[PDB]
Protein backbone atom coordinates (compact mmCIF):
# COMPACT_ATOMS: atom_id res chain seq x y z
CA UNK A 1 0.00 0.00 0.00
CA UNK A 2 1.24 3.42 1.15
CA UNK A 3 2.89 4.57 4.38
CA UNK A 4 1.55 8.14 4.61
CA UNK A 5 4.35 10.33 3.24
CA UNK A 6 3.46 12.75 0.44
CA UNK A 7 4.03 11.10 -2.98
CA UNK A 8 7.06 12.32 -4.91
CA UNK A 9 5.11 12.64 -8.16
CA UNK A 10 2.76 14.99 -6.31
CA UNK A 11 5.66 17.00 -4.85
CA UNK A 12 7.97 17.57 -7.83
CA UNK A 13 5.05 18.72 -10.00
CA UNK A 14 3.88 21.15 -7.29
CA UNK A 15 4.48 24.88 -7.55
CA UNK A 16 5.56 25.31 -3.92
CA UNK A 17 8.24 22.61 -4.31
CA UNK A 18 9.78 24.37 -7.28
CA UNK A 19 9.52 27.80 -5.64
CA UNK A 20 11.80 26.65 -2.81
CA UNK A 21 14.09 24.47 -4.89
CA UNK A 22 14.75 26.84 -7.77
CA UNK A 23 16.76 28.69 -5.12
CA UNK A 24 18.25 25.88 -3.04
CA UNK A 25 19.52 23.85 -6.00
CA UNK A 26 21.40 26.66 -7.82
CA UNK A 27 22.62 28.02 -4.48
CA UNK A 28 24.15 24.63 -3.61
CA UNK A 29 25.64 24.39 -7.09
CA UNK A 30 27.14 27.85 -6.72
CA UNK A 31 28.42 27.09 -3.20
CA UNK A 32 30.17 23.99 -4.51
CA UNK A 33 31.63 25.95 -7.42
CA UNK A 34 32.99 28.61 -5.06
CA UNK A 35 34.63 25.91 -2.94
CA UNK A 36 36.87 25.16 -5.95
CA UNK A 37 37.19 28.59 -7.57
CA UNK A 38 38.38 30.19 -4.32
CA UNK A 39 40.98 27.45 -3.86
CA UNK A 40 39.60 26.55 -0.44
CA UNK A 41 39.26 22.88 -1.46
CA UNK A 42 43.02 22.67 -2.00
CA UNK A 43 43.73 24.02 1.47
CA UNK A 44 41.10 22.03 3.39
CA UNK A 45 42.16 18.66 2.01
CA UNK A 46 45.89 19.08 1.41
CA UNK A 47 45.73 18.46 -2.33
CA UNK A 48 48.70 19.78 -4.36
CA UNK A 49 48.01 22.51 -6.88
CA UNK A 50 49.43 21.87 -10.39
CA UNK A 51 52.48 23.97 -9.44
CA UNK A 52 53.20 22.28 -6.09
CA UNK A 53 53.73 18.57 -6.84
CA UNK A 54 57.49 18.96 -7.11
CA UNK A 55 59.99 21.61 -6.32
CA UNK A 56 61.42 23.22 -9.44
CA UNK A 57 64.49 21.04 -10.06
CA UNK A 58 63.20 17.86 -8.45
CA UNK A 59 61.79 14.51 -9.49
CA UNK A 60 61.58 12.69 -6.15
CA UNK A 61 58.21 11.79 -4.69
CA UNK A 62 57.66 13.43 -1.26
CA UNK A 63 56.75 10.00 0.02
CA UNK A 64 55.89 9.59 3.70
CA UNK A 65 58.45 7.15 5.12
CA UNK A 66 57.91 7.24 8.91
CA UNK A 67 54.85 6.33 10.91
CA UNK A 68 54.90 8.72 13.87
CA UNK A 69 57.01 11.44 12.20
CA UNK A 70 54.74 11.36 9.13
CA UNK A 71 52.96 14.62 10.05
CA UNK A 72 56.30 16.44 10.30
CA UNK A 73 57.58 14.81 7.10
CA UNK A 74 54.71 16.16 5.00
CA UNK A 75 55.28 19.63 6.48
CA UNK A 76 58.98 19.40 5.66
CA UNK A 77 58.07 18.68 2.04
CA UNK A 78 55.63 21.60 1.87
CA UNK A 79 58.29 23.96 3.25
CA UNK A 80 60.61 22.82 0.43
CA UNK A 81 58.15 24.67 -1.80
CA UNK A 82 57.79 28.03 -0.01
CA UNK B 1 14.02 -42.78 33.64
CA UNK B 2 16.90 -44.53 35.48
CA UNK B 3 17.88 -43.26 38.93
CA UNK B 4 21.50 -43.45 39.99
CA UNK B 5 23.46 -42.48 43.07
CA UNK B 6 25.36 -39.76 41.22
CA UNK B 7 22.09 -38.71 39.60
CA UNK B 8 20.48 -38.09 42.99
CA UNK B 9 23.45 -36.00 44.11
CA UNK B 10 23.46 -33.78 40.99
CA UNK B 11 19.62 -33.58 40.90
CA UNK B 12 19.14 -30.03 42.30
CA UNK B 13 21.61 -28.58 39.79
CA UNK B 14 19.29 -29.50 36.91
CA UNK B 15 15.97 -28.62 38.57
CA UNK B 16 15.13 -24.98 37.73
CA UNK B 17 14.69 -25.14 33.93
CA UNK B 18 12.63 -22.12 32.91
CA UNK B 19 13.01 -20.08 36.12
CA UNK B 20 13.59 -16.41 35.32
CA UNK B 21 13.96 -13.22 37.28
CA UNK B 22 11.11 -10.78 36.54
CA UNK B 23 11.25 -8.05 33.92
CA UNK B 24 14.68 -6.64 33.11
CA UNK B 25 16.44 -7.95 36.25
CA UNK B 26 20.20 -7.43 36.15
CA UNK B 27 20.25 -6.17 32.53
CA UNK B 28 21.44 -2.64 33.46
CA UNK B 29 24.28 -4.04 35.56
CA UNK B 30 25.26 -6.39 32.71
CA UNK B 31 25.28 -3.38 30.37
CA UNK B 32 27.77 -1.62 32.63
CA UNK B 33 30.18 -4.55 32.55
CA UNK B 34 29.85 -4.80 28.78
CA UNK B 35 30.81 -1.15 28.44
CA UNK B 36 33.84 -1.57 30.67
CA UNK B 37 34.95 -4.65 28.74
CA UNK B 38 34.67 -2.89 25.36
CA UNK B 39 36.78 0.04 26.59
CA UNK B 40 39.19 -2.49 27.98
CA UNK B 41 39.46 -4.46 24.72
CA UNK B 42 39.89 -1.14 22.90
CA UNK B 43 42.97 -0.32 24.99
CA UNK B 44 44.41 -3.81 24.57
CA UNK B 45 43.82 -3.57 20.82
CA UNK B 46 45.27 -0.08 20.41
CA UNK B 47 48.31 -1.00 22.50
CA UNK B 48 49.01 -3.92 20.15
CA UNK B 49 48.27 -1.59 17.21
CA UNK B 50 50.67 1.14 18.47
CA UNK B 51 47.79 3.61 18.29
CA UNK B 52 47.87 3.88 22.09
CA UNK B 53 51.47 4.44 23.22
CA UNK B 54 52.17 4.10 26.95
CA UNK B 55 55.21 4.93 29.06
CA UNK B 56 57.42 1.92 29.65
CA UNK B 57 55.31 -0.33 27.38
CA UNK B 58 57.56 -1.30 24.46
CA UNK B 59 55.48 -3.38 22.01
CA UNK B 60 58.43 -5.22 20.50
CA UNK B 61 60.36 -8.48 20.88
CA UNK B 62 62.88 -6.35 22.83
CA UNK B 63 60.45 -6.51 25.75
CA UNK B 64 62.01 -9.91 26.52
CA UNK B 65 64.81 -7.80 28.04
Amino acid sequence: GTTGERPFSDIITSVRYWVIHSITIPALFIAGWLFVSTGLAYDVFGTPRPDSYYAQEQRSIPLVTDRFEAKQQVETFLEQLK
Amino acid sequence: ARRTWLGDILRPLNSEYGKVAPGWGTTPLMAVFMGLFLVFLLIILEIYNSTLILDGVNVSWKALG
Binding site: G4, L28, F29, G32, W33, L34, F35, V36, S37, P50 | -
Partner: protein, 34 residues
Amino acid sequence: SYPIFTVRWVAVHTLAVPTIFFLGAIAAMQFIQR
Protein backbone atom coordinates in the same frame (compact mmCIF):
# COMPACT_ATOMS: atom_id res chain seq x y z
CA SER C 1 -3.00 16.04 5.20
CA TYR C 2 0.66 15.30 4.50
CA PRO C 3 3.58 16.03 6.82
CA ILE C 4 6.40 17.91 5.16
CA PHE C 5 9.36 16.87 7.33
CA THR C 6 9.68 13.09 7.70
CA VAL C 7 12.39 10.48 8.05
CA ARG C 8 12.03 10.19 4.29
CA TRP C 9 12.61 13.94 4.00
CA VAL C 10 15.84 13.62 5.98
CA ALA C 11 17.10 10.63 3.98
CA VAL C 12 16.55 12.49 0.68
CA HIS C 13 18.24 15.75 1.62
CA THR C 14 21.01 13.82 3.34
CA LEU C 15 21.99 12.62 -0.16
CA ALA C 16 20.58 15.38 -2.39
CA VAL C 17 22.13 18.45 -0.74
CA PRO C 18 25.81 17.36 -0.87
CA THR C 19 25.30 15.78 -4.30
CA ILE C 20 24.47 19.14 -5.90
CA PHE C 21 27.23 20.86 -3.90
CA PHE C 22 29.69 18.27 -5.24
CA LEU C 23 28.34 18.64 -8.80
CA GLY C 24 29.04 22.38 -8.66
CA ALA C 25 32.54 21.71 -7.36
CA ILE C 26 33.20 19.17 -10.12
CA ALA C 27 31.82 21.49 -12.82
CA ALA C 28 34.15 24.27 -11.70
CA MET C 29 37.01 21.79 -11.96
CA GLN C 30 36.67 21.45 -15.74
CA PHE C 31 37.94 25.02 -16.18
CA ILE C 32 41.16 24.60 -14.19
CA GLN C 33 44.33 25.04 -16.24
CA ARG C 34 47.74 23.63 -15.43
